[PDB]
Design a binder for this molecule. Structure first.
Ligand code: SF4
Ligand code: MG
Ligand code: ZN
Lengths: 62, 289, 214, 77, 119, 85, 236, 245, 139, 225
């Protein structure tokens, strides 16, 4: 996908069709193309898997 | 007049971008009965619509951009405020980042919507957090023209200048300013000024005044320094803890000082100091001659 | 007699925005008025309850976005009844136009605002609650409470009767000596109405009092 | 006052980096907005705000204020 | 001093919603219409360098191509609630159809190897 | 008292859809204007008596010829006899 | 005509002797019309009293050093300058400083005559060591504003009389700025902020009142040309 | 074109009788002579910006008249021909107040964004309506006219007077294209004064956008009290190597 | 040129805190002068600043500079004073990280003056920084 | 210590130009007073001016009338220079009627009782032998500059042409601070303010109005107590 979107689309596509290559969507360009979160910055799974709750003291106060 | 984290939008553009928010808000305050009447009122441009717009627009960052975007400092988030006219107002300091001139350039404005987009535009991309350049680490948000000139005229030696005074001793900077108002003192003449306890002595400052049985502290001791009124006024712009500068400030020295400030101080203090330097530079560049 | 009832009603928490708007409009219409002085319109609302004035001021500030003064000097002059008066001078015209008292760039609306009418049952009962807080009484002189609340002009009274009808609660408008009110006489309707308004302890006390005496 | 406050350094003292702070503040802001939207219903879900607010204040500002004050916690699931 | 024919009256334009194109459903371009400003490659690179993923995702999906997401975003804004999650842009589907018309057997898989069928 | 100097001089709407907006009954229980069962037709008649667009309401009702409710301060058979006269 | 929006003045107090006044909402312009005039009249149009010259015993006009005193002559003069005094006699009046022995010589040891007062006796003047003696004469008189050291009036009058700069004005520092204030109606209306810092004797409010009185008199001077002339009326 | 000659003057061959768009007495005149001082002023002329005076707005020193033309045509369709008429289906008469008897706006009438210049109606034919709209129509008893409105409205952000209207009718011998039955053109003119955001320049390649317009009483004034009309930045002269200015 | 540079090096992002590697580049500082006194080399602000030390430096049986430090100007001045010329720093060219690179080998982030974060996108920044000044180089 | 107080005296250069000498002021104080007076004079002196016109056979500004040598837009610029003075709070109307060849000088305007036109030699238009000018002018009161979109009323007819209004009787003001060193044993100043008005009022009245405007602000300053 990235190679095709760079340049020489016809040659890249006809080379990938014969080999039956599979794209795993690990880069930035592919994720941008298909429209999901890029795997960098705030799009990583380290940061997005959390739980935000008030402290017991704060909830008790209000 | 803007701050380093502010921009000015024309009210037509602001009302067009923020149409749904304004409609919701003025249906919420009972200014309109439903969405249809609210949309009609917004489209026809009534009076209350702008009053509501000026409060829905608060604390909602907008991303400003100029093409070509050669590096990531070409997109930056600013807090918008309404202005009268049809042209966007931009802080003079950020121009070098955008490579923006005022000979007829144009810029584009985008509006984040979701909470994540606002958090990113407010924490990552804010304008007063991007002093340094990613290429080499030297500041780009720095006083460049008409401010370097003012700060150079303020802090420079009177080689061929008409230096009046040249031997007077003053008890404070206020007295020096009072003498300057009358035609008795020059901004570049050398005089002895006494400073209060708070000030920090210049780096170096090899002699703590020779004594016998009475020490001195690096801070909290009043000392007399022989300098010009211009340097005394320039040192009122820098933070309270910064050592006295006491030397002519071109553009290399200003870059060194700004880099030191960015390295050693928090971001709010650095932004405030940059605003102070900008204001003083313009003020003393007008009277530079 | 009614001080505890009005205290309980004032202390009742409220969440929905439309009901708060209806309550504010009702109280302003009944126990409020407008004055054109110094070329500007000022809204003055007189209440004789401790918490009700604070509640009205908070509602105005929250939903309508305005500031009030909350003076305690008695317009009556006795200063014993604690005749609280809440005032709105800044943006008074906007508040009057956006709360239903005046609409269409014309005369003040005699009845309740059209927004309050033809609304959900919650807004109808909120309007009745505001009307009771503003003016009203619970006499119980003889056999029935005579839960009478006075209104300015036949329009407000008959609008209150209509709102009460939507609650499946009987009511009757009446006029005497040039002043008109809405009253409900039978005990069952009184109890159901007071229960709907939100008061609980007063409702019980009235229930046991009526059952024991009758 | 405004976008400048609260200072970014004080916030970062309560988290690991900017990237985690963005998600943390955004999630709290979504919780506050969801609580406000369904306030008309009588519901027990979502909580806050835990600080004194204005008439109409953006939920993100309130979330950042609570984060700075230290009234929240973050776990990893 | 001369007065040039570059008046600001004819330079200012803004948009929140307007006409859309036919084949690909992105906002129309120009100023005679309402028109949308372009977000080219360089701006995408700048946002990627900043590390802003959610802002980029919303710019690329629920502002240009996500046909069913535009109306939902507008409704959410007007009713005052949370913005919904983005979908999948129409341009990707058009691209897949164009490649399939060339006798190329494209197919998007799940965590296991089963096609999603793209509706 | 609180007359606002007969609508005062502060107005920004400067727009009116029609004579519907000046209807007084809109500030009043709609149900009372359609007496069911036997009902009564005098209180709402009094309400209509003070309406400022009574003539317009009567004219529109007659032109469209509604045979229900009370319009322009008149009930069904008053309208019928006026139509027949 | 009519002003149509009456400006008002409000005060804020920072320290015991620092204030910040805000005047708003001023018409377009009118922020610089009465800003610089306010600053000038505050700084140099208010009477006061101050020291004019000294005569330290045993020291000529040479400022090499003061025997028996740790501080040099420049420090002594600067310390004397910070002294705040009040007086009533038009002619200059002389008072004597007679402190002696090792220790600390402060302003509380002066012996002012009748009609002259010192408003900060706790001020430090110098330090004495080695059983030295400090004999001084201080001449004080009245004036306005800041006047530099009056040079030698008569060369042969005496030997040791050192003249000094005189700061008569109670107000020490003044600054001002203007901003835009109005939001509801058309903007660009001016708001003026004036920051004032005086000395221990006078309060900023009195200085502002005196400045207002002086300017009112000065401009009534011009108004007297034709009293029946239409201006900008204000109402209340 | 203005006039130069007088009612009694004698003219020789080739002499000038009337000026042109931007000529003054027969010679080119593209701008105005303004009193300029070179100095940096409070940062309002920072980096090529320009500070102007209010005297140039009071006296129309830099005012210009601009004109625009709008076109609309009525043609044939499947469901009969379109019509240019004043009877717009559902709009208040207040909107249809300045329109002429032919449905075309009247000369001399000012317009603002949203107003209709030509009233046009196109037939649409029978269509299915959603249940809610059907119930609304039943409540209000209105009837679909079978024709929708396609009038000509001024674009967004436009203003001005109406200078003229020109109408061609295919049945009046006019040579309209095939399929067009009627055509009409409306001319809208407006006078623009100089405002910030506008771009000025000189003859030596020194351009800049007006970023400030100060009152007359706070411009620098010479010893006799004459304010300066424009303030330029000296820093742009030496680095750009144009000492000609 | 910038398009090509961005494409070749887009998938280079930080994905670790430390790979534990001990390998590094031998970078020279304090070129010997003709006077016999060590003087800091001219091109050090863009060669050794903002870069960690792979192995600790030991002179006179001490620790002149501990391992894994930012290596600012103070440390360089101290090293030059102590009489040191070559230092074994850490660079991406010698990173053993199994996934991408790691923050320690990359070093400090010049845009914020702090250690690069675990989600940073360094390839795009490098491409943009290299390509931006290409409009000033005489063709 | 100096008891002498300031004082103001007048000198007349010509009919409409005066020089006011104020002395003896404190040192460094003349420039501020001079500039304050200059700003007030150039800003807030009330007057009157024409705020609208309508001609018999004209619909808008961008047209010409038969028999005249000038457009309507080039006649608006000529009537914008009329120096009129009015005593009526409400708007007043004047009529201009001319027939036959010649010049329509400003003296031909026939104003009602209460208003006056002070430059009767201004040239408005030139008429040939087949031209008649019948025009109606509106005069109001105010101060400063009004941009002809404030002069647009709600019920404007198609034939009414609003016009820019310039209410300013003052023409040129300057000042000179002679450091005369007035013999008082010390340093002092001597301010000299030169005022020229545009033949609508006399400089004494302008100075009096400026002083009356300026005294009020410092009056609200002095009431701080
Ligand atoms: S006359 Fe018609 S509009 Fe008026 S109150 Fe009666 S029913 Fe309503
Ligand atoms: Mg340019
Ligand atoms: Zn590594």
């Amino acid at each position: 996908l990235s190679a095709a979107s760079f340049q020489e689309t016809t040659r890249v596509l006809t080379d990938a069709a014969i080999n039956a290559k599979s794209d795993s969507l690990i880069g930035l360009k592919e994720n941008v193309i298909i429209g999901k979160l890029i795997p960098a910055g705030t799009g990583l799974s380290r940061y997005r898997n959390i739980r935000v709750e008030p402290t017991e003291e704060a909830k008790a106060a209000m | 007049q803007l701050k380093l984290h502010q921009c000015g939008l024309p009210k037509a553009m602001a009302l067009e971008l923020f149409k749904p928010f304004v409609m919701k808000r003025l249906v919420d305050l009972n200014h309109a009965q439903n969405i249809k009447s609210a949309k009609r009122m917004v489209e026809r441009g009534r009076t209350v619509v702008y009053d509501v717009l000026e409060e829905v627009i608060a604390e909602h960052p907008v991303l400003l951009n100029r093409a070509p975007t050669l590096h990531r400092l070409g997109i930056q988030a600013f807090e918008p405020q309404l202005v009268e006219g049809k042209a966007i107002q931009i802080h003079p300091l950020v121009c070098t980042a955008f490579n923006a001139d005022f000979d007829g350039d144009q810029m584009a404005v985008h509006l984040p919507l979701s909470a994540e987009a606002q958090a990113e535009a407010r924490i990552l991309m804010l304008s007063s957090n991007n002093i340094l350049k990613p290429a080499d680490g030297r500041p780009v948000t720095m006083p460049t023209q008409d401010m370097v000139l003012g700060l150079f005229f303020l802090t420079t030696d009177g080689e061929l200048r008409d230096t009046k005074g040249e031997g007077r001793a003053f008890g404070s900077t206020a007295e020096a300013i009072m003498a300057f108002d009358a035609g008795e003192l020059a901004l570049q003449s050398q005089i002895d000024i006494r400073f209060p306890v708070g000030t920090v002595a210049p780096r170096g400052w090899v002699p703590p005044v020779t004594e016998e049985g009475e020490p001195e502290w690096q801070q909290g001791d009043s000392f007399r320094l022989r300098t010009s009124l211009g340097r005394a006024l320039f040192n009122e712009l820098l933070p309270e803890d910064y050592p006295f500068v006491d030397y002519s400030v071109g553009k290399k020295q200003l870059s060194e000082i700004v880099n030191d400030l960015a390295e050693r101080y928090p971001k709010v203090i650095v932004a405030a100091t940059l605003d102070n330097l900008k204001a003083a530079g313009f003020y003393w560049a007008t009277r530079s001659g | 007699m009614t001080a505890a009832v009005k205290d309980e009603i004032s202390r009742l928490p409220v969440t929905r925005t439309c009901c708060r708007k209806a309550e504010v409009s009702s109280i302003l219409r009944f126990a409020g008025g407008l004055h054109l002085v110094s070329g500007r319109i000022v809204i003055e609302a007189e209440l004789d309850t401790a918490m009700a004035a604070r509640r009205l001021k908070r509602d105005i500030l929250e939903i309508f976005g305005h500031s009030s003064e909350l003076i305690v000097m008695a317009p009556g002059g006795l200063r014993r009844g604690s005749r609280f008066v809440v005032r709105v001078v800044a943006g008074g015209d906007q508040l009057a136009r956006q709360t239903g008292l005046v609409d269409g760039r014309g005369r003040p609306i005699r009845g309740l605002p059209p927004q309050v009418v033809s609304g959900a049952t919650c807004d109808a009962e909120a309007a009745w609650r505001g009307a009771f807080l503003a003016h009203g009484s619970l006499t119980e002189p003889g056999r029935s409470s005579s839960l009478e609340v006075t209104c300015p002009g036949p329009e407000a009274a008959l609008a209150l009767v209509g709102a009460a009808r939507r609650l499946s609660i009987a009511a009757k408008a009446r006029e005497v000596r040039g002043v008109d009110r809405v009253v409900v006489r039978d005990g069952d309707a009184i109890g159901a109405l007071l229960t709907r308004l939100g008061a609980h302890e007063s409702v019980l006390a009235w229930e046991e009092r009526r059952m024991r005496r009758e | 006052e405004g976008i400048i406050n609260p200072p970014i350094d004080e916030l970062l003292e309560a988290t690991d980096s900017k990237y985690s702070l963005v998600i943390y503040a955004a999630k709290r802001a979504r919780q506050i907005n969801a609580y406000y939207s369904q306030l008309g219903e009588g519901l027990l879900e979502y909580v806050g705000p835990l600080v004194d607010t204005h008439v109409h204040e953006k939920p993100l500002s309130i979330a950042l204020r609570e984060i700075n004050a230290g009234l929240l916690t973050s776990e990893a699931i | 001093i001369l007065k040039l024919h570059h008046l600001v009256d004819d330079k200012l334009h803004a948009r929140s919603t307007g006409p859309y194109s036919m084949i690909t459903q992105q906002p129309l371009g120009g100023k005679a219409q309402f028109g949308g400003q372009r977000f080219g490659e360089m701006e995408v690179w700048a946002l990627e360098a900043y590390g802003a993923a959610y802002a980029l995702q919303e710019l690329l999906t629920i502002k240009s191509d996500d046909v069913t997401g535009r109306v939902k975003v507008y409704e959410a804004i007007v009713k005052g609630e949370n913005i919904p999650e983005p979908g999948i842009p129409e341009s990707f589907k058009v691209l897949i159809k164009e490649m399939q018309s060339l006798c190329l057997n494209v197919e998007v898989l799940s965590s296991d190897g089963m096609s999603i069928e793209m509706r | 008292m609180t007359e606002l100097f007969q609508e005062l001089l502060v107005e920004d709407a400067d727009e009116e859809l029609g004579w519907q907006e000046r209807a007084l009954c809109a500030q009043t229980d709609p149900e009372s204007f359609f007496p069911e069962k036997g009902g009564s037709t005098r209180e709402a008649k009094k309400v209509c008596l003070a309406c400022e667009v009574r003539s317009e309401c009567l004219e529109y009702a007659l032109q469209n010829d509604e045979r229900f409710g009370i319009w322009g301060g008149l009930s069904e058979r008053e309208r019928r006899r006026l139509k027949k006269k | 005509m009519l002003i149509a929006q009456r400006p008002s003045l409000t005060e804020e107090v920072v320290d015991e002797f620092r204030s910040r006044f805000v005047i708003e909402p001023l018409e377009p312009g009118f922020g610089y019309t009465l800003g610089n005039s306010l600053r000038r009249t505050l700084l140099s149009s208010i009477p006061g009293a101050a020291v004019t010259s000294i005569r330290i015993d045993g020291v000529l006009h040479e400022f090499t050093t003061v025997p028996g005193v740790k501080e040099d002559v420049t420090d002594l003069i600067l310390n004397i300058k910070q002294l705040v005094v009040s007086s009533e006699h038009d002619e200059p009046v002389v008072m004597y400083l007679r402190k002696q022995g090792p220790g600390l010589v402060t302003a509380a040891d002066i012996a002012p005559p009748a009609g002259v007062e010192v408003h900060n006796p706790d001020l430090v003047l110098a330090t004495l060591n080695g059983k030295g003696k400090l004999e001084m004469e201080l001449t004080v008189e009245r004036g306005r504003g800041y006047v530099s050291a009056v040079q030698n009036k008569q060369v042969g009058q005496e030997i040791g009389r050192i003249p000094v700069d005189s700061i008569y004005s109670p107000v020490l520092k003044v600054t001002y700025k203007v901003e835009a204030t109005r939001v509801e109606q058309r903007t660009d209306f001016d708001k003026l902020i004036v920051d004032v810092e005086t000395k221990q004797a006078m309060r900023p409010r009195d200085a502002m009142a005196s400045a207002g009185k002086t300017l009112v008199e000065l401009f009534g001077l011009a108004r007297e040309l034709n009293i029946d002339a239409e201006g900008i009326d204000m109402g209340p | 074109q203005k006039v130069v000659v007088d009612e009694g003057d004698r003219v020789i061959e080739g002499q000038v009788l009337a000026d042109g768009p931007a000529t003054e007495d027969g010679e080119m005149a593209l701008g105005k002579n303004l009193l300029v001082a070179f100095m940096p002023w409070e940062g309002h002329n920072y980096e090529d910006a320009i500070i102007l005076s209010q005297r140039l707005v009071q006296d129309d020193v830099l005012s210009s008249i601009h004109i625009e033309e709008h076109e609309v045509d009525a043609r044939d369709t499947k469901l009969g021909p379109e019509e240019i008429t004043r009877d717009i289906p559902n709009v208040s008469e207040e909107v249809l107040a300045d329109l002429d008897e032919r449905g075309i706006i009247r000369i001399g009438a000012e317009v603002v964004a949203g107003d209709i210049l030509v009233g046009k109606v196109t037939p649409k034919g029978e269509t299915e309506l959603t249940p809610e709209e059907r119930l609304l129509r039943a409540i209000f008893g209105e009837k679909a006219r079978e024709v929708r409105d396609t009038s000509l409205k001024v674009p967004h952000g436009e203003i001005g007077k109406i200078i003229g209207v020109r109408v061609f009718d295919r049945e009046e011998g006019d040579e309209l294209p095939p399929g067009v039955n009627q055509l009409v053109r409306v001319y809208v003119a407006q006078k623009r004064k100089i405002t910030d955001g506008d771009k000025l320049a000189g003859r030596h390649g020194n351009k800049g956008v007006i970023s400030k317009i100060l009152p007359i009483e706070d411009m620098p004034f010479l010893e006799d009290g004459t304010p300066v009309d424009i303030i330029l930045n000296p820093l742009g002269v030496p680095s750009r190597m144009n000492p000609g200015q | 040129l910038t398009r090509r540079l961005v494409d070749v090096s887009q998938d280079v992002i930080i994905r670790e805190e430390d790979c534990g590697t001990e390998r590094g580049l031998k970078l020279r500082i304090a070129e010997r002068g003709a006077d016999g006194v060590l003087r800091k080399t001219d091109d050090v602000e863009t060669s050794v600043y903002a870069r960690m030390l792979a192995e600790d430096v030991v002179v006179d049986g001490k620790v002149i500079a501990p391992a894994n430090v930012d290596l600012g100007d103070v440390l360089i001045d101290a090293l030059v004073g102590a009489g040191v010329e070559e230092v074994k720093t850490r660079s991406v060219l010698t990173c053993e990280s199994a996934v991408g690179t790691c923050a320690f080998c990359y070093g400090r982030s010049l845009a914020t003056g702090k250690l690069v974060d675990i989600g940073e996108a360094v390839g795009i920044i490098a491409a943009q920084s290299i390509g931006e000044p290409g409009t000033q180089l005489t063709m």
